[PDB]
Design a protein around this ligand. Structure first.
Ligand SMILES: NCc1ccccc1
Ligand SMILES: [Ca+2]
Length: 223
């Protein structure tokens, strides 16, 4: 997250870190046994880390649970990033409390102008590299589809939205991928892609979760 603020420990209780020896992507806890992330975060050998603030220090609220099954969306296209969404089943159920909690799936799609919360452990610089150890947060609005398509001609599908600031300075970044965009208490987006971080006229692009609720629910019900 570039241009954000320190969230505070366990203030984003649905945020998970995906770990393969190191943090590599975010995700969101959607019930006691399932996480949603980005398909482009797929790899074998995932441990899901719940209850994290500092990812390099054991602080006392963590739960570390290995994945039993990963399911990339049937229509994920790694060249265009269309359908950039993946479900991860935990080997055992997490213990839910105020500091580790699920986020609800949306009933309706959010409109442009809605303010959302984006969070992650990704790079904090637009030029160069600095990776934080504690969770960072950013408040950002959903942009109109027309602004999004004008920023990224030929690249925005109906399964994507833009959020952020056309003036730059505040954005998600590498290492935030897979993490949540929460608006009005519901999971509306997944950190997906963009051109660089926090550059003028190049806002972040997010997977539009409201298009996937039926697939998510059906998949959970049968796996
Ligand atoms: N600035 C959007 C973004 C998010 C994740 C990875 C790359 C770029
Ligand atoms: Ca920790």
């Amino acid at each position: 997250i570039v241009g954000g603020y320190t969230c505070g420990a366990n203030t984003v209780p649905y945020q998970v870190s995906l770990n393969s020896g190191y943090h590599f992507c975010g995700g969101s806890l959607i019930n006691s046994q399932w996480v949603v992330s980005a398909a482009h975060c797929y790899k074998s050998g995932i441990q899901v880390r719940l209850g994290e603030d500092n990812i390099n220090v054991v602080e006392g609220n963590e739960q570390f649970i290995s994945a039993s099954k990963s399911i990339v969306h049937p229509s994920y296209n790694s060249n265009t990033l269309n359908n950039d969404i993946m479900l991860i089943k935990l080997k055992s159920a997490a213990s839910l409390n105020s500091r580790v909690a699920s986020i609800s799936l949306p009933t309706s799609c959010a409109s442009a102008g809605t303010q959302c919360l984006i969070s992650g452990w990704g790079n904090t610089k637009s030029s160069g590299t600095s990776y934080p150890d504690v969770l960072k947060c950013l408040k950002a609005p959903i942009l109109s589809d027309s602004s999004c398509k004008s920023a990224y001609p030929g690249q925005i599908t109906s399964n994507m939205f833009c959020a952020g600031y056309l003036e730059g300075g505040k954005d998600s970044c590498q290492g935030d991928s897979g993490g949540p965009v929460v608006c009005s208490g519901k999971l509306q987006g997944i950190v997906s892609w963009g051109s660089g971080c926090a550059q003028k006229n190049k806002p972040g692009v997010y997977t539009k979760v409201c298009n996937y609720v039926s697939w998510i629910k059906q998949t959970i019900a049968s796996n």
